Ligand binder design. Sequence first.
Ligand SMILES: [K+]
Ligand SMILES: [K+]
Ligand SMILES: [K+]
Ligand SMILES: [K+]
Ligand SMILES: [K+]
Ligand SMILES: [K+]
Ligand SMILES: [K+]
Ligand SMILES: [K+]
Ligand SMILES: [K+]
Ligand SMILES: [K+]
Ligand SMILES: [K+]
Ligand SMILES: [K+]
Ligand SMILES: [K+]
Ligand SMILES: [K+]
Ligand SMILES: [K+]
Ligand SMILES: [K+]
Ligand SMILES: [K+]
Ligand SMILES: [K+]
Ligand SMILES: [K+]
Ligand SMILES: [K+]
Ligand SMILES: [K+]
Ligand SMILES: [K+]
Ligand SMILES: [K+]
Ligand SMILES: [K+]
Ligand SMILES: [K+]
Ligand SMILES: [K+]
Ligand SMILES: [K+]
Ligand SMILES: [K+]
Ligand SMILES: [K+]
Ligand SMILES: [K+]
Ligand SMILES: [K+]
Ligand SMILES: [K+]
Ligand SMILES: [K+]
Ligand SMILES: [K+]
Ligand SMILES: [K+]
Ligand SMILES: [K+]
Ligand SMILES: [K+]
Ligand SMILES: [K+]
Ligand SMILES: [K+]
Ligand SMILES: [K+]
Ligand SMILES: [K+]
Ligand SMILES: [K+]
Ligand SMILES: [K+]
Ligand SMILES: [K+]
Ligand SMILES: [K+]
Ligand SMILES: [K+]
Ligand SMILES: [K+]
Ligand SMILES: [K+]
Ligand SMILES: [K+]
Ligand SMILES: [K+]
Ligand SMILES: [K+]
Ligand SMILES: [K+]
Ligand SMILES: [K+]
Ligand SMILES: [K+]
Ligand SMILES: [K+]
Ligand SMILES: [K+]
Ligand SMILES: [K+]
Ligand SMILES: [K+]
Ligand SMILES: [K+]
Ligand SMILES: [K+]
Ligand SMILES: [K+]
Ligand SMILES: [K+]
Ligand SMILES: [K+]
Ligand SMILES: [K+]
Ligand SMILES: [K+]
Ligand SMILES: [K+]
Ligand SMILES: [K+]
Ligand SMILES: [K+]
Ligand SMILES: [K+]
Ligand SMILES: [K+]
Ligand SMILES: [K+]
Ligand SMILES: [K+]
Ligand SMILES: [K+]
Ligand SMILES: [K+]
Ligand SMILES: [K+]
Ligand SMILES: [K+]
Ligand SMILES: [K+]
Ligand SMILES: [K+]
Ligand SMILES: [K+]
Ligand SMILES: [K+]
Ligand SMILES: [K+]
Ligand SMILES: [K+]
Ligand SMILES: [K+]
Ligand SMILES: [K+]
Ligand SMILES: [K+]
Ligand SMILES: [K+]
Ligand SMILES: [K+]
Ligand SMILES: [K+]
Ligand SMILES: [K+]
Ligand SMILES: [K+]
Ligand SMILES: [K+]
Ligand SMILES: [K+]
Ligand SMILES: [K+]
Ligand SMILES: [K+]
Ligand SMILES: [K+]
Ligand SMILES: [Mg+2]
Ligand SMILES: [Mg+2]
Ligand SMILES: [Mg+2]
Ligand SMILES: [Mg+2]
Ligand SMILES: [Mg+2]
Ligand SMILES: [Mg+2]
Ligand SMILES: [Mg+2]
Ligand SMILES: [Mg+2]
Ligand SMILES: [Mg+2]
Ligand SMILES: [Mg+2]
Lengths: 142, 166, 258, 90
Amino acid sequence: MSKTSGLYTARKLRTVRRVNRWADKKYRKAHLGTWLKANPLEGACMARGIVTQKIGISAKQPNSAVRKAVRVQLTKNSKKITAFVPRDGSITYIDNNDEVLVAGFGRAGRAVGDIPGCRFKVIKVAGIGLLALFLRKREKRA
Amino acid sequence: PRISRHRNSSKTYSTPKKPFTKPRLDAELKLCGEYGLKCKREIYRARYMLAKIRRTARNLLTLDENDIKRRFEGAALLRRLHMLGILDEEKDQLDYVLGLRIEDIFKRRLQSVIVESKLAKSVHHARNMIKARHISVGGQIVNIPSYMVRISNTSRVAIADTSSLA
Amino acid sequence: ARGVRKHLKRLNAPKHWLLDKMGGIWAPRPTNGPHGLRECIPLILILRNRLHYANTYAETSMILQDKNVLIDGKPRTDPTFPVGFMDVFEIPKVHKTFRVLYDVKGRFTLVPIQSNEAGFKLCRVQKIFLGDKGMPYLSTHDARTIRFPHPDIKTNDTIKINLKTGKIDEWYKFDIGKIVMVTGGRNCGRIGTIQAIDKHMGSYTMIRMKDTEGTEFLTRLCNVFVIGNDSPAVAIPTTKGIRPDIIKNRELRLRSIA
Amino acid sequence: EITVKVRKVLNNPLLQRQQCVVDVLHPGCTYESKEAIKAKVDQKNIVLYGFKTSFGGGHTVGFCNAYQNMDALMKYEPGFRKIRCGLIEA
RNA sequence: AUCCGGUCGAUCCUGCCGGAGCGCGACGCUCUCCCCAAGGACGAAGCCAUGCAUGCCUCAGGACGCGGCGGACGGCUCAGGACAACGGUUGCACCCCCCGUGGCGGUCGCCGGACACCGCUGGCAACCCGGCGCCAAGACGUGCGCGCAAGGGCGGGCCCCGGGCGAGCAGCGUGACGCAGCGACGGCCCGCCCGGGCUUCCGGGGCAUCACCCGGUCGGCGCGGUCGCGGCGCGCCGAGGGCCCGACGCCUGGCGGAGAAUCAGGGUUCGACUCCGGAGAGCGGGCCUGCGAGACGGCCCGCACAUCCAAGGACGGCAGCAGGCGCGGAACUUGCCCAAUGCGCGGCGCGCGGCGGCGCGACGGGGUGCGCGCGAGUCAGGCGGGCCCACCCCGACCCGCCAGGGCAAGGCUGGUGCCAGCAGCCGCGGUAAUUCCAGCUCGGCGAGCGUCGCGCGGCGCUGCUGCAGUUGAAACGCCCGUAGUUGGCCCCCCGCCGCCACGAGGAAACGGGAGCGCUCCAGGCAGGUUGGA
Ligand SMILES: [K+]
Ligand SMILES: [K+]
Ligand SMILES: [K+]
Ligand SMILES: [K+]
Ligand SMILES: [K+]
Ligand SMILES: [K+]
Ligand SMILES: [K+]
Ligand SMILES: [K+]
Ligand SMILES: [K+]
Ligand SMILES: [K+]
Ligand SMILES: [K+]
Ligand SMILES: [K+]
Ligand SMILES: [K+]
Ligand SMILES: [K+]
Ligand SMILES: [K+]
Ligand SMILES: [K+]
Ligand SMILES: [K+]
Ligand SMILES: [K+]
Ligand SMILES: [K+]
Ligand SMILES: [K+]
Ligand SMILES: [K+]
Ligand SMILES: [K+]
Ligand SMILES: [K+]
Ligand SMILES: [K+]
Ligand SMILES: [K+]
Ligand SMILES: [K+]
Ligand SMILES: [K+]
Ligand SMILES: [K+]
Ligand SMILES: [K+]
Ligand SMILES: [K+]
Ligand SMILES: [K+]
Ligand SMILES: [K+]
Ligand SMILES: [K+]
Ligand SMILES: [K+]
Ligand SMILES: [K+]
Ligand SMILES: [K+]
Ligand SMILES: [K+]
Ligand SMILES: [K+]
Ligand SMILES: [K+]
Ligand SMILES: [K+]
Ligand SMILES: [K+]
Ligand SMILES: [K+]
Ligand SMILES: [K+]
Ligand SMILES: [K+]
Ligand SMILES: [K+]
Ligand SMILES: [K+]
Ligand SMILES: [K+]
Ligand SMILES: [K+]
Ligand SMILES: [K+]
Ligand SMILES: [K+]
Ligand SMILES: [K+]
Ligand SMILES: [K+]
Ligand SMILES: [K+]
Ligand SMILES: [K+]
Ligand SMILES: [K+]
Ligand SMILES: [K+]
Ligand SMILES: [K+]
Ligand SMILES: [K+]
Ligand SMILES: [K+]
Ligand SMILES: [K+]
Ligand SMILES: [K+]
Ligand SMILES: [K+]
Ligand SMILES: [K+]
Ligand SMILES: [K+]
Ligand SMILES: [K+]
Ligand SMILES: [K+]
Ligand SMILES: [K+]
Ligand SMILES: [K+]
Ligand SMILES: [K+]
Ligand SMILES: [K+]
Ligand SMILES: [K+]
Ligand SMILES: [K+]
Ligand SMILES: [K+]
Ligand SMILES: [K+]
Ligand SMILES: [K+]
Ligand SMILES: [K+]
Ligand SMILES: [K+]
Ligand SMILES: [K+]
Ligand SMILES: [K+]
Ligand SMILES: [K+]
Ligand SMILES: [K+]
Ligand SMILES: [K+]
Ligand SMILES: [K+]
Ligand SMILES: [K+]
Ligand SMILES: [K+]
Ligand SMILES: [K+]
Ligand SMILES: [K+]
Ligand SMILES: [K+]
Ligand SMILES: [K+]
Ligand SMILES: [K+]
Ligand SMILES: [K+]
Ligand SMILES: [K+]
Ligand SMILES: [K+]
Ligand SMILES: [K+]
Ligand SMILES: [K+]
Ligand SMILES: [Mg+2]
Ligand SMILES: [Mg+2]
Ligand SMILES: [Mg+2]
Ligand SMILES: [Mg+2]
Ligand SMILES: [Mg+2]
Ligand SMILES: [Mg+2]
Ligand SMILES: [Mg+2]
Ligand SMILES: [Mg+2]
Ligand SMILES: [Mg+2]
Ligand SMILES: [Mg+2]
């Protein structure tokens, strides 16, 4: 019957499911424990760090552009990341020592769109929300 | 702990699963037009309050006509549905509960009752008059547009004796 | 812990006390005495919670300091004193005498009784044993002790005690066809006649009884109290140990607001 | 005001008092105080407390402790209610 | 009990990627009124200035002191610990227990002296103490008394089977020891009660790139120790004990349950925190006093850290309540009070707990009009409250956040010209852009909307119900074969399993659910003979 039947086979039916559960990439990513170790944010929604550089990144094949990003050192584990800055003209609030709050792009650690090697993005600069800085609701000191 | 930790609370509405469906999007605003509804939540609440009384009946109807659970809870459900006027006397069968719509629930609101007896010209004027403490239920001043009026208490809906319209 | 418990949270109090879950973090903890924690009621829960002679704890104390309450003929000055099944409850200044029994929902009720009845008590023989220098003793459901009992009295019988001398004047034997009342479980409070006794070697002995309308029920032998011989030796509530079904109870409830 | 009624009267010769629930009816107007309606419910042995007004007005419910002696009130009454009536003030 | 966009010139599939719902936190923007309500848990059980968290009543005006009861309960936390703990279910004929409530009470003439508070003198930086002296008891000490505390030797029947059992159990008699406890205001002792200690059966995480493991380990005999049984410890004797029905080892950002999130049915995931149980108090150990502690708002020692100082010494433990530092994406006042609910002593005590303050974590109700009267505010009096306030009553004045090509509801002008930028996915932009930046208009949800991460759903892409294996990923090259799983037909009316039904017994809160107009409502257990089934 391609599966075992019979009134006394509960142990086998449970062993098979336990073994074949690991064959799914989603389950293996969320349950094995290697992704939690390798995750730069250590399983958190966001993380703060200091900017070490400003950079421009080429887009992928069918598009043509220079995307604006920053290399960031993490406070809590001293890892190296790169984070994207959205919203036209926003790369002008980022001095080379500016505490930044950084979150993900969505897709839970996968690159999106046309930016090669980018999985994070800046949401706050030196204490102030970057979106409200673009919408002209608050301003930086000087 | 503090005593307040033992107090219960609950959500009383369910949002739909596909938000951007056109036919129920305009069917949902004809309802906001025939009744002075503030926002979509007051529709959601209604459907939620239907979805429970529909779950009970279908549980008892799967049972047998002579079981005590049917004899007890179906009688309780019918006795509760007849006092609020959500269901009428001539339908005293548990199978008459399943074909109920939301409009039956909306028709027993105080805002709707006062419109029926023509105390208010429209439903919007009725809502305004409700907020102004201008209407009493059984000699008791009721401020709530969403108030649910029992058939016992529908003979006795008036303007309040204390009022500027008296 | 490192020692005995002296507190009792409100949600952890026995469910037949009918305590309400707001209005307090704590509940009274019954003091040790004639009755256990689970099968009792703290005395305060009658004077304040039920009869409203007092309205707070502090003014419930002063009623019991000046000794206005007698339990089995003695003034108890302790608010968490455990009063329980068959205890005589007499308040003289209001001339109220009660006997503490169970109702048909397993809760304590007070039954008015006459001055010709409050001078005696029914106890259940819990055990016979040899004490010091080999003398015989019997122990009851009230933590009472009697030396040199008449040899006929055996375990599970009930005895009748005058409430001033503290001696025995009558006894009822546990048999077939005796009138009985259940003191705990889930048939607590209802009254019937014994029609079976099934012993199981090593294990519990079960009793089958039958009400006065003929309803039959079962329980353990540790829960059946004899109240007489085909006629109850005492007074019982108006319902007389007949338990309605939920439908008839509902129609009686509908009739009260009617 | 013009309408004062009482129910749930319990005589308590242990605390030397009588306990009551009082309903006050004042359609349209206020009832001005408890010190006012104290006449309808001697006067100095009446202890009035726990008064609530319903929504819209017109109804009030409260509680009465009516003592018989005067030592009884200084003995069995909480030490802050005797200051709300001006009887001690410390 | 629902799907939709993306592989091609076009087409049907497999298959994933993306979208659409609910919940929990964090971030952004924004906020009129009222009710309910969580709040330094998240590999830092990291470190702590200051104040508070435990007191209340026999002998003289009172304090003070002596004596007594309590401080082992209550509060905090989740570090350790995976055949533990914990949940249901048994037992002690192997046990200990304060208070309280019943009992019981037979034991080979009013005694003594001395300690603190206190006087007189001192030492010391301060912590803390010394010397001499008059004085009491419901404190000790010794005791007046009809002999009886522990332990011990004999008192059983050689198919099979009341004092009290299912069960030879408990008492008593009689020979020897012993001289305990209770007696200077009469209590040793006994039953119950609550509580504890262990204990029977079933349940009780992952990894096989951990296949063999253990040697007081498995059993027996004898003593010791314990409240008590027991390899619990010690001497002697034997070689046992566990394992693919997964032992042993390793790992866990592992406290368990009652429960919670999601939602056709079957399921998946999480169990910091309210109740119940366990464990700890910087980390190891040790102990005294007591009925009860291996106690940390008790003591002693080692270690790691701090504190004052005349340099001789003395001295500490916020995972209590506030508060601070550090850390982190992430979490409030150094408030008032014993009035309530309860606990200790009886009149007090109590950072238990209660009341206010901060509080868009989250819940519930009502507004920004209607065809012409209101609420939000203001000032007074009530009501309430430990005292003030909020609510209620009477009197006189008076949005926003995201979008607009498709998925997916909603389309004209200027700027920019593969640049700037958008875009979860398809894609958009090359100087006519339905998508960038703006203006107008329009759409959705709405005092609340968007973004990030995670759980559940979507998903019959984990499949027991219920997937796939000719060619899309997938039948071992073949035969034998143990454990495992499975096994034709037949006798009915016995026994022993399983299985179905009905009972008994044990916890509430949660979850359902009968009845009841907190003005409705989230609630609560109310109420007008009652009720909480
Ligand atoms: K198959
Ligand atoms: K299959
Ligand atoms: K198979
Ligand atoms: K089988
Ligand atoms: K499989
Ligand atoms: K504990
Ligand atoms: K103890
Ligand atoms: K204790
Ligand atoms: K409680
Ligand atoms: K409670
Ligand atoms: K509680
Ligand atoms: K107590
Ligand atoms: K489904
Ligand atoms: K396609
Ligand atoms: K093709
Ligand atoms: K396809
Ligand atoms: K923390
Ligand atoms: K912690
Ligand atoms: K975590
Ligand atoms: K977190
Ligand atoms: K911390
Ligand atoms: K003690
Ligand atoms: K102590
Ligand atoms: K805390
Ligand atoms: K833990
Ligand atoms: K104790
Ligand atoms: K065990
Ligand atoms: K066991
Ligand atoms: K066990
Ligand atoms: K087990
Ligand atoms: K494994
Ligand atoms: K050995
Ligand atoms: K041994
Ligand atoms: K040995
Ligand atoms: K050996
Ligand atoms: K294993
Ligand atoms: K942990
Ligand atoms: K289901
Ligand atoms: K499943
Ligand atoms: K299910
Ligand atoms: K499903
Ligand atoms: K918490
Ligand atoms: K805890
Ligand atoms: K807990
Ligand atoms: K608890
Ligand atoms: K507990
Ligand atoms: K506990
Ligand atoms: K605990
Ligand atoms: K502990
Ligand atoms: K520790
Ligand atoms: K320590
Ligand atoms: K330690
Ligand atoms: K230690
Ligand atoms: K220690
Ligand atoms: K102990
Ligand atoms: K120790
Ligand atoms: K220790
Ligand atoms: K402190
Ligand atoms: K902690
Ligand atoms: K505080
Ligand atoms: K910080
Ligand atoms: K910070
Ligand atoms: K108090
Ligand atoms: K005590
Ligand atoms: K407090
Ligand atoms: K007005
Ligand atoms: K006003
Ligand atoms: K005006
Ligand atoms: K106005
Ligand atoms: K006006
Ligand atoms: K845009
Ligand atoms: K995405
Ligand atoms: K998509
Ligand atoms: K697409
Ligand atoms: K153009
Ligand atoms: K799935
Ligand atoms: K599913
Ligand atoms: K499904
Ligand atoms: K198949
Ligand atoms: K392949
Ligand atoms: K292959
Ligand atoms: K292949
Ligand atoms: K094959
Ligand atoms: K194979
Ligand atoms: K083979
Ligand atoms: K074969
Ligand atoms: K074979
Ligand atoms: K085989
Ligand atoms: K087999
Ligand atoms: K099998
Ligand atoms: K088999
Ligand atoms: K077969
Ligand atoms: K069965
Ligand atoms: K309970
Ligand atoms: K009655
Ligand atoms: Mg504790
Ligand atoms: Mg050997
Ligand atoms: Mg748990
Ligand atoms: Mg827990
Ligand atoms: Mg906490
Ligand atoms: Mg402690
Ligand atoms: Mg310790
Ligand atoms: Mg931070
Ligand atoms: Mg409202
Ligand atoms: Mg599935």
